[PDB]
Design a protein around this ligand. Structure first.
Ligand SMILES: *[C@@](O)(Cc1ccc(O)cc1)C(=O)O
Length: 307
């Protein structure tokens, strides 16, 4: 029911083996020792994608507010000279230090991402014109504003790939054309109509889309559309690897929480999935004002900012 650390170690080993993902035993023990409290007090959850052999990820969504980046550096999980540290510092220090850091880790490779919840609907300009970002990335602000992607709720630094994932909420409903315009940012081949129609059927009215930017070129590598807390009997068509993941990864939460993401990019499309483990993922998502599958997905503050 509750978070226990020895059980977590075993569930990491077991789940990685179940989906055919790599394992790094000592590195995983270091993450757990460095961030025990973070996992225990937050929502701890699982992630992977439909790419064959992909990593099993485990994360904490934070209730405890602290400098998780400094902790990761302390523990030898992140290089003290990582060139993206400046950006994560800039983002953490906005709005007088209100943003809260969470963390993603890979069972095979250690620290993967630092994720910031900014504590409201933030102007995209604030996020995208901190001086720590290069000109080439700041220049994409206008592409985003042109598509009406004007408010940001989260941003993640991907330490492994030197890129950033920016999470926007758009005023919808999302239609074929707006899908196409967002998808076109990614450079990848337009998909067939049933792909689009299925994605649209899972979106709330005011939709969540993640855009992945390379922090050195400003290239948009990837876009991802998300459906949160989809019940098992309402799931869209999924890759057998994702179906297996949702079956084998253990969830102890009172309310089960599965997340489905459709990722499109030039290197290949895939499906992302998240699944609750402990510490009440749904209750943290509700706190962030996320919209769940089969609900009212209307954002009134967003709608007042657009009128
Ligand atoms: C988006 O769907 C982003 C998102 C994705 C996964 C989790 O777990 C939380 C949020 C949104 O709701 O803002």
């Amino acid at each position: 029911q509750e978070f226990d650390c020895e059980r977590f170690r075993a569930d990491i080993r077991a789940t990685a083996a179940a989906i055919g993902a790599p394992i790094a035993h000592r590195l995983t023990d270091t993450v757990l020792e460095a961030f025990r409290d973070n996992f225990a007090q937050g929502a701890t959850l699982w992630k992977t994608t439909s790419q064959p052999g992909d990593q099993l990820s485990y994360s904490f969504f934070s209730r405890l507010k602290m400098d998780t980046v400094s902790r990761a550096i302390d523990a030898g999980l992140l290089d003290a000279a990582h060139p993206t540290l400046a950006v994560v510092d800039a983002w953490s220090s906005l709005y007088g230090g209100a943003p809260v850091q969470s963390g993603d880790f890979d069972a095979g490779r250690g620290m993967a991402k630092t994720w910031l919840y900014f504590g409201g609907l933030r102007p995209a300009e604030d996020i995208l014109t901190v001086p720590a970002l290069p000109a080439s990335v700041q220049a994409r602000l206008k592409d985003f504003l042109a598509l009406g992607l004007a408010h940001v709720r989260f941003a993640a630094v991907d330490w492994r790939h030197h890129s950033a994932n920016v999470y926007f909420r758009g005023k919808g409903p999302l239609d074929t054309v707006q899908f196409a315009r967002i998808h076109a940012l990614s450079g990848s081949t337009p998909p067939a109509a049933h792909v689009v129609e299925e994605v649209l059927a899972y979106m709330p009215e005011d939709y969540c889309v993640a855009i992945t930017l390379d922090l050195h070129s400003g290239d948009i590598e990837r876009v991802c559309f998300y459906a949160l807390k989809v019940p098992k009997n309402a799931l869209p068509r999924i890759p057998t690897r994702i179906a297996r993941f949702l079956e084998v990864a253990p969830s102890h939460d009172v309310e089960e929480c599965n997340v489905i993401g459709w990722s499109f990019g030039r290197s290949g499309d895939y499906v992302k999935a998240e699944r609750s483990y402990t510490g009440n993922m749904a209750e943290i998502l509700a706190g962030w004002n996320c919209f769940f599958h089969g609900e009212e997905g209307r954002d009134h503050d967003l709608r007042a900012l657009h009128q």
